[PDB]
Design a protein around this ligand. Structure first.
Ligand SMILES: C[S@@+](CC[C@H](N)C(=O)[O-])C[C@H]1O[C@@H](n2cnc3c(N)ncnc32)[C@H](O)[C@@H]1O
Length: 284
């Protein structure tokens, strides 16, 4: 009897760049070590689960809408055994995070043991763009974060930066349905398809297509995150900006965490990384 699985042959040109992203998420998640209640908005397949465990978070609440992803998080938890401090409890909530923030806050608060006052941190990595659809969706996101947090709680966001993408497209003179491409030794490494007519950054609703790597030109559409607009809506809802910084700024520390991968990062890697950034906000 035999079972065989053949993946497409895939080169390693994304080695160093994806190790940089992992290092960044780890340094961010390390900052909330041993907190009692941490909520993750858009937790997916649990890619950050190893990080949350290494940080000793005590109660992780992970919310996502994709039952398939969440099952992979369950398999990941139960395969792969752990025993390091003191053990994190995990609560997975299957929920569409575009629904009214009041309902989502009620379901979360009904999780056995969730604090009436609220959690200590909200983490969301590469998710908030799904909610940049229109003004109501951004307000909903800020009201949901306000309801789930205790005062002084913090929001730890990670996102593609819409200002930088628009600036990137303009400097390369990319018009409506055209594509910016990275290219390395004659292969398209990264790419962005412009899908907005406007030449000025809109609050909400501007789409681009990002190339999915190792596909044969499959582009997946996302909205642009206007971080100015995001931070401004969060300000209207009781949050102060704490920190806002490009992923490119972790590259020097990265040299101390694997000198090897540091030296292999290419100029296309650095340009792609520059499009992503961290944003910390605190509830007043
Ligand atoms: C880029 S992924 C991965 C997020 C994860 N924290 C990570 O860094 O890998 C974004 C996740 O957002 C989830 N998502 C997209 N739209 C959503 C919605 N309306 N409600 C809840 N989750 C959503 C997807 O299921 C996906 O797992």
């Amino acid at each position: 009897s035999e079972f065989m699985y053949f993946a497409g042959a895939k080169t390693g040109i994304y080695r160093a760049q994806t190790a940089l992203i992992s290092f960044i998420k780890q340094e961010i998640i390390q900052k909330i070590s041993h907190q009692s209640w941490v909520i993750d908005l858009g937790i997916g397949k649990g890619q950050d689960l190893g990080r949350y465990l290494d940080a000793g978070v005590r109660h992780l609440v992970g919310i996502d809408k994709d039952q398939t992803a969440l099952a992979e998080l369950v398999y990941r938890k139960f395969s792969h055994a752990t025993t390091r401090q003191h053990a994190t409890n995990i609560y997975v909530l299957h929920q569409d995070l575009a629904e009214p923030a009041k309902e989502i806050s009620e379901k979360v608060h009904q999780i056995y043991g969730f604090p009436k006052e609220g959690a200590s941190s909200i983490v969301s990595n590469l998710f908030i763009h799904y909610l940049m659809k229109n003004t109501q969706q951004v307000e909903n996101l800020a009201v949901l974060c306000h309801k789930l947090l205790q005062p002084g709680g913090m929001v730890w966001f990670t996102t593609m930066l819409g200002e930088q993408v628009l600036e990137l497209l303009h400097e390369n003179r990319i018009e409506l349905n055209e594509v910016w491409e990275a290219r390395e030794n004659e292969v398209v490494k990264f790419a962005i398809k412009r899908l907005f007519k406007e030449d000025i950054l809109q609050e909400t609703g501007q789409e681009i297509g990002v190339l999915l790597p190792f596909s044969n030109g499959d582009f997946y559409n996302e909205y642009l995150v206007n971080t100015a607009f995001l931070i401004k809506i969060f300000k209207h809802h009781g949050f102060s900006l704490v920190q806002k910084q490009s992923f490119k700024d972790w590259i020097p520390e990265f040299q101390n965490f694997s000198k090897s991968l540091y030296k292999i990062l290419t100029e296309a890697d650095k340009t792609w990384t520059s499009l992503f950034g961290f944003i910390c906000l605190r509830k007043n």
